[PDB]
Design a protein around this nucleic acid. Structure first.
Ligand code: MET
Ligand SMILES: [K+]
Ligand SMILES: [K+]
Ligand SMILES: [K+]
Ligand SMILES: [K+]
Ligand SMILES: [K+]
Ligand SMILES: [K+]
Ligand SMILES: [K+]
Ligand SMILES: [K+]
Ligand SMILES: [K+]
Ligand SMILES: [K+]
Ligand SMILES: [K+]
Ligand SMILES: [Mg+2]
Ligand SMILES: [Mg+2]
Ligand SMILES: [Mg+2]
Ligand SMILES: [Mg+2]
Ligand SMILES: [Mg+2]
Ligand SMILES: [Mg+2]
Ligand SMILES: [Mg+2]
Ligand SMILES: [Mg+2]
Ligand SMILES: [Mg+2]
Ligand SMILES: [Mg+2]
Ligand SMILES: [Mg+2]
Ligand SMILES: [Mg+2]
Ligand SMILES: [Mg+2]
Ligand SMILES: [Mg+2]
Ligand SMILES: [Mg+2]
Ligand SMILES: [Mg+2]
Ligand SMILES: [Mg+2]
Ligand SMILES: [Mg+2]
Ligand SMILES: [Mg+2]
Ligand SMILES: [Mg+2]
Ligand SMILES: [Mg+2]
Ligand SMILES: [Mg+2]
Ligand SMILES: [Mg+2]
Ligand SMILES: [Mg+2]
Ligand SMILES: [Mg+2]
Ligand SMILES: [Mg+2]
Ligand SMILES: [Mg+2]
Ligand SMILES: [Mg+2]
Ligand SMILES: [Mg+2]
Ligand SMILES: [Mg+2]
Ligand SMILES: [Mg+2]
Ligand SMILES: [Mg+2]
Ligand SMILES: [Mg+2]
Ligand SMILES: [Mg+2]
Ligand SMILES: [Mg+2]
Ligand SMILES: [Mg+2]
Ligand SMILES: [Mg+2]
Ligand SMILES: [Mg+2]
Ligand SMILES: [Mg+2]
Ligand SMILES: [Mg+2]
Ligand SMILES: [Mg+2]
Ligand SMILES: [Mg+2]
Ligand SMILES: [Mg+2]
Ligand SMILES: [Mg+2]
Ligand SMILES: [Mg+2]
Ligand SMILES: [Mg+2]
Ligand SMILES: [Mg+2]
Ligand SMILES: [Mg+2]
Ligand SMILES: [Mg+2]
Ligand SMILES: [Mg+2]
Ligand SMILES: [Mg+2]
Ligand SMILES: [Mg+2]
Ligand SMILES: [Mg+2]
Ligand SMILES: [Mg+2]
Ligand SMILES: [Mg+2]
Ligand SMILES: [Mg+2]
Ligand SMILES: [Mg+2]
Ligand SMILES: [Mg+2]
Ligand SMILES: [Mg+2]
Ligand SMILES: [Mg+2]
Ligand SMILES: [Mg+2]
Ligand SMILES: [Mg+2]
Ligand SMILES: [Mg+2]
Ligand SMILES: [Mg+2]
Ligand SMILES: [Mg+2]
Ligand SMILES: [Mg+2]
Ligand SMILES: [Mg+2]
Ligand SMILES: [Mg+2]
Ligand SMILES: [Mg+2]
Ligand SMILES: [Mg+2]
Lengths: 97, 221, 124, 118, 152, 244, 205
RNA sequence: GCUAAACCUAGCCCCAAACCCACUCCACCUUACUACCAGACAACCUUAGCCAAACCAUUUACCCAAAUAAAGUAUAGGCGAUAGAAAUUGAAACCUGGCGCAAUAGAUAUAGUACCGCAAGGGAAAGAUGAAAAAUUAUAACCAAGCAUAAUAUAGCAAGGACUAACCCCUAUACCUUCUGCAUAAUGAAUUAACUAGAAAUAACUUUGCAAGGAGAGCCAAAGCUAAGACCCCCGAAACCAGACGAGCUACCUAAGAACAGCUAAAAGAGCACACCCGUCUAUGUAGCAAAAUAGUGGGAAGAUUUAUAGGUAGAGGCGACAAACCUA
RNA sequence: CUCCGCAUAAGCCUGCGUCAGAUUAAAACGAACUGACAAUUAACAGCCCAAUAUCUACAAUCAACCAACAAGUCAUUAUUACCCUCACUGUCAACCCAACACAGGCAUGCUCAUAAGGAAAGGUUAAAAAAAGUAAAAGGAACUCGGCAAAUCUUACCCCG
RNA sequence: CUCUUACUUUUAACCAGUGAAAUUGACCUGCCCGUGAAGAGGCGGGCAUAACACAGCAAGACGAGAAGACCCUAUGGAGCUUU
């Protein structure tokens, strides 16, 4: 029980597909391109996470500030509660003061 | 299961008939040898001509040798339970007869000698375009020595002996689907004459129970 | 304990509820004093059944019938087949005026007609 | 039932008869009145804030004198605005799942049949 | 007619007329004993007993003396695999009594004599199943289970 | 997921679709404009920069309006921009005491005003501020026309403005029909507020009122297809004759 | 008719049949079968077509297609790719063994050239008249669509009109004269029904 | 040997992109889903509180529409906890992706269905053959606990040292938690499978880069600066507040109904005593027939009686012949 | 045995009718389980009414004597308008509220012991303990907190209200 | 009650059918004395000791049940009263 009786289907990984072959290209666009474009401009994803890093509280604060007006009512309510809980956890609870 | 779902364009494709178009009754006392004759020959010739229409390169004289090879190879498939090859040698009417009773038994069948050359006794064909298909049945007389030794599920001797051949006189009926381009001559059934001698007795003893009478019922002579 | 999912029909409720709910059948009159029902003859629908004697059309059509393309009837086609020949005949004769549009079949108002197209006041 | 397909043919014949007759009446109604529907109606916003096509019913007194008709509410109060947004966002989530799932199926399909690149 | 808006009638107005009625009725065999002149119908819910009297006389030219109708409650006890109640549709039962002393008996729509065609059938599949079953014989007890295919 | 547009922009998007698209441009621009009301319940600083007394530094200052609640009954009068003040107070003006709820209500008076343009007297509920504004404007008619919409704070006041603007726009002769000289004198007095009649009809109307008015203007019976098909048939026959 | 479940698995038995209901009860939920999408115009296999089997025990053999299942890209060739099963089995009788065809994918069969009985690839092309037909790639020969019996089991040539079948002359007779009158108005004139009472105006809201 | 076990899909999550959605006929605000009759009833109105200040009473972050920076600075504050700008500065922006989940996961979802509640509301469980089932005598097997094949022989945390030998001999006071200290007769645990609990700044340290400079504007700098690595759990109250839903039970009331044999006295908030209402005492029952009953014995039974139907009073309240009663166990 | 029973109201909604099913009913092959087919037919009951003005002091109780207080369920007229007909809906059951095929709850009419409706014992044995009854020598509250319980059916007094 | 007894029914026990619940660390689950977190089937010294059902009993397993309601503690609540 809890373990499969047959081998799973084999994993076929194409190490030389277009995505892996051209991975990392243009990462030095600033260095080799007269600094016209920063490498952080290649990042694709959420508009509040392009070229920016932070903990859970900082991400929640930043997302609410940038796209809070575009969020759904239920999604926004959960985000507001998450910030309240994270504010109490980080600023009031922990081993170190 | 008797009939598929109604109102379907697709229909079951049968590869053989269910029986013999005209049963060939062998003459009495034929084993001792080992006007009407012309009428039977003329009827056979007409059916041969229709067979030669679908297959121009067909000879009646070569059939008994071809029939002998099919008969030997079909029974040799029972020894090793080679059902895949057996379907190509016997028809769908003959396959259940050969294999149903030996599924959990070991069969050791062998061919020793041919006492008398095989003779074609009857060649006949079905009515033209029964369902768009025309079938031709050829009956071959075989008088050969064979050895049979059947073992039960536990490997114990059940019928026959492995080293004593005996004379066998049987009339094997073959069938081919003329309309099918990929059809071939395959064993269809066997004809058992009423005057055929009884087979060898089995080894074990069998009890035949009497009627099972309810308490209200009574036994009668 | 009540079944909310079941359809609410006239078989449920007290005596007052059961007698007030109906099954969708249209009324054919009204109730006067003493609970006496007065059936209006005009409110009762009348079945206009034609004479079928000597009728050559049967419920089914023989399969030896040529296939024909489906061309739904539109207002433009109806106008051309019914009104265009009348207007063209008068146009060539030189006697055509907008005042005589009622001659060609135009109805300015549906009021005063037994069967009014809009709002519809007749059954199927 | 002996030959059940006879009933289907009759229903289709009568449905076609309704269609042909309705087309003649619809075409005639457009020529004489220009209305696209025989039964009058109007677009109304119900008490729940939804836009609905209210079919008009026949009465013997004007609408302002109708006690039962004037108890209905064909307007939405401000407290219904939030529920309209929640229902709108509910439809957005349902449509987003449907569109995203379709892209997942196509990617799975290409794995099974790699020759469909073209 | 059903699923239509009946034109409203005001005093002194025209007669209400229906030209292509969509009311469909089916003659049904009664489940209990009925008088010889009583004919039972299943009619739509929107159909009143007044309409059925005009329906039969107008279309079938059947003289009608009295009509009585009732509403039958379809069963709502069945449960599917989801434990969801399945509602058998409710139907209205109408009883019609003939006028001029006429009597009606429900005919036998499936006579046994007509259901048996004297003409033979030439189905290859049906014939093959029947022929093989008769041709093949049962096992002989004295053989003791030994296969009978072999001629030896 | 995320909305394509922010929620607060949904109202403005609705003005670009539906019947609101076909509203007059001059009316729509009036709704978009949101001027700051004249301060009533708070004293503006009057300067953009003030020197902070403590650090002696120049600090930017801003006027934050006090939120004002206008009861629905205020729309039937002329309160002059006043309204209820819903707020909190500290007991004995001490921040260490309790924070209590306090509501300040204007003192309402019933007064009768005569409008020269409308030639009618109205019994309007007003405050003492409304009297001062009318006195500073030298008449009710001047006060209604001069005061902007955001400062009137009254639906009745905007309705009075529309009535006066319509008469000035039309040079309506119903004002003193038997005294043409007197009628021209009053119109000459308020000629500076004259606007085209098309724009005057939409002054003071709410969004719902404007939509209903626009719907009535656009409400017309559909043209029967018989008349349309006649025009095409007649035109095509004439073109055929030219080719022959 | 029957609203099939979203992931119903089509099989050899037609949907809604007795066998299908037992195999596919209303509560069954199996893994969907990944089927390569083929457009209706791209599909080129029809009932009665002669195709050659490419894979299986009957590789290289040619037969006639008897059934096509578009939901599975299946073609059934009569008497080819067949396994044997017992039919009509009872408690006493072992049953009758019959060959049973197994479905073949569209990629496992190849249409044959009418001139030379060999498998060939085809493409859909339009003739001069504008009809869309199948053209062999290598030989450029038109492959006609096979004549298959209609699904309703009716032969127009071997058809006799019954007591309730309208004749061709009566069915195609045009008795409709266009006019600006409704069906109700024409019937009143036809049957001579006279109505002088006028319909009162009613309030719609 | 059974019971079971195993599976890969259904779909889902987070983003990008893009601004969604209403009506065949018929029915639907009255008791919704009800063909057909005198309306004139009509929307607006500061959130509170938990919580933090180790009590609490002023006070205690909550998208308000440009990423960054100015800056956690000015400033505010039981000048405590904590709150916190602006001028100014000024960038990028190619939907069709995944070091996301794979049936106790991922949405609650096969479904807001079954089921539960008068109502508001709460809210599931699960599926698995194959190319073909028109191949069903098919797709072998081995794997938890629980059993069966196969009950048991002096003696003892069940084991260890061993031994020719299972036991007999010798040695040995289960585990976790909690405590000065537990074999403790302190806590938790029948057992199996799955699920279930350490999130981050300030400096400092370590290892690279460059160096009086470091850093891809801001910032730091008397060897600094930039970048990386590395430290901060889970379940549980009684409560408080806001907005809804509840008087079909019960408390009392309103409208209009119903019941009360016989005997005594004949006048009766009178007596005896059925129906009926109540529940004094005893036994039985205590996972019961019953989340308050049964049997007997009792109180009342023409009255301040009992009772059917519809309506009313709603939680900062109602209602109360005050029992802190009763307001859906 | 008969605690009932029959019917209406209320509630429930096809929930022991037929056929085909051997699925179960706290046991059990009939069916309350499954599928299909049947059914409850209006006279009873529900669903009512043109306008305006106007009228309506004197209970009920066998309503007659009699005596009441708590002072009571039942009524029109005038003028105008109005010629028309029998629709629609409820109708079944062994049934509802209590998680149950609950010793519980449940309005009215009639029967007042039955014409209607029902079965306390699966079979056996006849131990203890326990439960429900009957009978008892002599004594008769010596029991016990107390005459609790049972039996019999009675006297006097006190406290509180 | 002295002072209990007899019989019947239910229960009971046995046979057949159907088939719960609290409980349960593992148990190969004795007595005496002593000891010990102070009251031992499990530790020390002795004694006893083939195995395993069924029916009774209620001295013990600090028996089961309910995170003691008594008491105290908490900068935990709540109702009520007030100069
Ligand atoms: C002392 O009396 C203590 N056991 C409290 C008794 S009442 C719960
Ligand atoms: K912390
Ligand atoms: K523990
Ligand atoms: K503890
Ligand atoms: K101890
Ligand atoms: K202890
Ligand atoms: K304890
Ligand atoms: K009970
Ligand atoms: K109430
Ligand atoms: K029921
Ligand atoms: K005795
Ligand atoms: K004990
Ligand atoms: Mg419910
Ligand atoms: Mg959904
Ligand atoms: Mg009826
Ligand atoms: Mg609806
Ligand atoms: Mg605090
Ligand atoms: Mg405290
Ligand atoms: Mg300070
Ligand atoms: Mg401090
Ligand atoms: Mg799930
Ligand atoms: Mg879904
Ligand atoms: Mg195991
Ligand atoms: Mg030992
Ligand atoms: Mg030891
Ligand atoms: Mg201690
Ligand atoms: Mg110790
Ligand atoms: Mg112990
Ligand atoms: Mg312990
Ligand atoms: Mg403890
Ligand atoms: Mg447990
Ligand atoms: Mg950390
Ligand atoms: Mg760290
Ligand atoms: Mg816990
Ligand atoms: Mg508080
Ligand atoms: Mg509150
Ligand atoms: Mg009540
Ligand atoms: Mg009252
Ligand atoms: Mg009495
Ligand atoms: Mg009394
Ligand atoms: Mg009671
Ligand atoms: Mg009482
Ligand atoms: Mg008494
Ligand atoms: Mg309320
Ligand atoms: Mg009371
Ligand atoms: Mg008291
Ligand atoms: Mg007290
Ligand atoms: Mg009854
Ligand atoms: Mg009833
Ligand atoms: Mg049934
Ligand atoms: Mg009925
Ligand atoms: Mg009646
Ligand atoms: Mg009845
Ligand atoms: Mg209960
Ligand atoms: Mg009961
Ligand atoms: Mg009886
Ligand atoms: Mg017994
Ligand atoms: Mg005893
Ligand atoms: Mg006793
Ligand atoms: Mg006694
Ligand atoms: Mg005695
Ligand atoms: Mg005494
Ligand atoms: Mg004593
Ligand atoms: Mg004593
Ligand atoms: Mg006593
Ligand atoms: Mg005393
Ligand atoms: Mg007293
Ligand atoms: Mg016992
Ligand atoms: Mg248990
Ligand atoms: Mg447990
Ligand atoms: Mg032992
Ligand atoms: Mg022992
Ligand atoms: Mg001791
Ligand atoms: Mg010892
Ligand atoms: Mg024992
Ligand atoms: Mg205990
Ligand atoms: Mg104890
Ligand atoms: Mg405790
Ligand atoms: Mg206490
Ligand atoms: Mg304390
Ligand atoms: Mg403390
Ligand atoms: Mg507190």
């Amino acid at each position: 029980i809890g373990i499969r009786l047959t081998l799973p289907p084999p994993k076929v990984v194409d190490r030389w597909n277009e995505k892996r072959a051209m991975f990392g290209v243009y990462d030095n666009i600033g260095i080799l391109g007269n600094f016209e474009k920063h490498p952080k401009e290649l990042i694709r994803g959420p508009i509040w996470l392009r070229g920016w890093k932070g903990n859970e509280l900082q991400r929640c604060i930043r997302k609410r500030k940038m796209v809070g007006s575009r969020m759904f009512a239920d999604d926004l309510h959960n985000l507001n509660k998450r910030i309240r809980y994270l504010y109490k956890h980080f600023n009031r609870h922990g081993k170190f003061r | 299961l008797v009939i598929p779902p109604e109102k379907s364009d697709r229909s079951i494709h049968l590869a053989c008939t269910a029986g013999i178009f005209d049963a060939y009754v062998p003459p009495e006392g034929d084993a001792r040898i080992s006007t009407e004759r012309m009428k039977k020959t003329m009827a056979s010739q007409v059916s041969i001509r229709r067979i030669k229409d679908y297959d121009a390169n067909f000879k009646i004289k070569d059939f008994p040798e071809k029939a002998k090879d099919i008969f030997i190879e079909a029974h040799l498939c029972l020894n090793n339970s080679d059902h895949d090859r057996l379907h190509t040698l016997v028809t769908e009417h003959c396959f259940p007869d050969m294999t149903w009773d030996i599924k959990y038994k070991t069969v050791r069948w062998s061919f020793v000698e041919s006492l008398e050359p095989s003779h074609v006794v009857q060649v006949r064909c079905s009515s033209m375009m029964n369902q768009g298909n025309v079938y031709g049945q050829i009956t071959v007389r075989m008088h050969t020595r064979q050895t049979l030794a059947i073992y039960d599920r536990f490997g114990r001797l059940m019928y026959g002996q492995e080293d004593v051949p005996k004379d066998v006189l049987e009339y094997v009926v073959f069938e081919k689907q003329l309309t099918n381009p990929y059809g071939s001559w395959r064993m269809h059934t066997k004809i058992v004459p009423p005057w055929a001698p009884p087979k060898q007795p089995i080894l074990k003893t069998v009890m035949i129970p009497g009627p099972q009478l309810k308490p209200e019922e009574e036994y009668e002579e | 304990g009540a079944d909310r999912m079941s359809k609410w029909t006239s078989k449920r409720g007290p005596r007052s509820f059961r007698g007030r709910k109906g099954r969708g059948a249209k009324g054919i009159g009204f109730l006067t004093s003493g609970w006496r029902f007065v059936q209006i003859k005009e409110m009762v629908p009348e079945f206009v059944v034609p004479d079928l004697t000597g009728f050559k059309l049967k419920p089914y059509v023989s399969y030896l019938a040529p296939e024909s393309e489906e061309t739904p009837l539109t207002a433009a086609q109806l106008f051309s087949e019914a009104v265009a020949p009348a207007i063209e005949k008068d146009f060539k004769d030189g006697t055509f005026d907008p005042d005589n549009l009622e001659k060609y079949g135009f109805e300015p108002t549906q009021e005063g007609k037994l069967f009014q197209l809009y709002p519809r006041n007749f059954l199927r | 039932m002996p030959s059940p397909e006879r009933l289907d043919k009759v229903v289709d014949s009568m449905d076609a008869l309704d269609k042909v007759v309705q087309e003649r009446e619809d075409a005639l109604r457009l020529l004489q009145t220009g209305q696209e529907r025989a039964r009058p109606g109007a677009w109304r916003r119900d008490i729940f804030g939804r836009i609905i096509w209210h079919k008009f019913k026949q009465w013997v007194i004007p609408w302002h004198l109708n006690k039962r008709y004037n108890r209905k509410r064909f307007f939405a109060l401000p407290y219904v605005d939030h529920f309209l947004r929640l229902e709108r966002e509910k439809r957005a989530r349902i449509k987003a799942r449907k569109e995203n799932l379709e892209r997942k199926k196509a990617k799975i399909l290409l794995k099974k049949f790699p020759h469909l690149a073209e | 007619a059903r699923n239509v808006v009946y034109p409203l009638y005001r005093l002194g107005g025209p007669q209400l007329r229906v030209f292509r009625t969509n009311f469909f009725i089916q003659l049904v065999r009664p489940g209990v004993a009925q008088p010889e002149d009583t004919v039972q119908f299943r009619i739509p819910m929107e159909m009143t007993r007044v309409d059925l009297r005009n329906y039969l006389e107008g279309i079938y030219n059947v003289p009608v003396a009295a009509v009585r109708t009732r509403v039958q409650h379809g069963s709502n006890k069945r449960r599917d695999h989801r434990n969801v109640r399945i509602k058998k549709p409710d139907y209205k039962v109408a009883y019609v009594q003939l006028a001029h002393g006429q009597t009606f008996t429900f005919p036998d729509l499936f006579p046994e004599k007509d259901e048996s065609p004297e003409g033979s059938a030439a189905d290859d599949l049906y014939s093959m199943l029947e022929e093989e079953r008769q041709q093949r014989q049962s096992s002989d007890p004295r053989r003791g289970g030994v296969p009978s295919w072999f001629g030896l | 997921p995320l909305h394509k547009y922010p929620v607060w922009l949904w109202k403005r998007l609705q003005l670009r679709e539906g019947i609101c698209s076909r509203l007059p441009g001059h009316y729509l621009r009036s709704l978009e404009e949101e001027r700051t009301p004249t301060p009533v319940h708070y004293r503006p600083h009057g300067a953009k920069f003030k020197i902070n007394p403590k650090n002696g530094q120049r600090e930017r200052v801003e006027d934050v309006p006090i939120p004002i609640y206008f009861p629905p009954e205020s729309q039937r009068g002329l309160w002059g921009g006043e309204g209820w003040i819903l707020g909190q107070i500290y007991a004995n003006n001490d921040k260490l005491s309790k924070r209590l709820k306090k509501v300040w209500k204007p003192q309402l008076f019933e007064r009768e005003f005569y409008s020269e343009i409308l030639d009618k007297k109205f019994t309007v509920t007003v405050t003492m501020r409304t009297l001062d504004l009318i006195d500073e404007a030298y008449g009710l008619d001047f006060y209604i026309l001069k005061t902007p919409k955001e400062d009137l704070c009254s639906k009745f006041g905007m309705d009075l403005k529309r009535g006066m603007l319509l008469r000035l726009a039309r040079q309506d002769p119903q004002l003193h029909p038997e005294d043409p000289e007197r009628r021209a004198a009053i119109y000459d007095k308020y000629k500076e507020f004259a606007i085209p009649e098309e724009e005057a009809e939409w002054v003071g109307l709410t969004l719902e009122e404007a939509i209903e008015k626009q719907r009535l203007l656009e409400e017309k019976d559909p043209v029967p297809l018989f008349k349309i098909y006649v025009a095409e048939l007649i035109q095509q026959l004439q073109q055929q004759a030219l080719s022959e | 008719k029957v609203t099939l479940p979203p992931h119903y698995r089509y099989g050899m038995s037609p949907p809604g049949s007795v066998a299908d209901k037992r195999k596919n009860p209303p509560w069954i939920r199996r893994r969907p079968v990944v089927v390569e999408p083929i457009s209706d115009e791209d599909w080129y296999l029809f009932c009665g077509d002669t195709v050659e089997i490419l894979e299986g025990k009957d590789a290289g053999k040619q037969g006639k297609v008897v059934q096509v299942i578009r939901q599975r890209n299946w073609v059934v060739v009569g008497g080819l790719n067949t396994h044997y099963r017992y039919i009509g089995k009872t408690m006493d009788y072992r049953g009758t063994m019959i060959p049973s065809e197994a479905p073949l994918l569209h990629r496992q069969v190849k249409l044959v050239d009418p001139m030379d009985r060999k498998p060939t690839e085809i493409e859909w092309r339009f003739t001069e008249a504008g009809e869309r037909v199948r053209v062999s790639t290598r030989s450029g020969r038109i492959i006609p669509k096979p004549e298959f019996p209609r699904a309703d089991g009716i032969v127009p040539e071997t058809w006799i009109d019954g007591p309730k079948d309208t004749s061709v002359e009566d069915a195609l007779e045009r008795t409709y004269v266009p006019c600006l009158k409704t069906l109700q108005e024409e019937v009143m004139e036809a049957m001579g029904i006279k109505e002088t009472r006028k319909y009162k105006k009613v309030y719609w809201y």
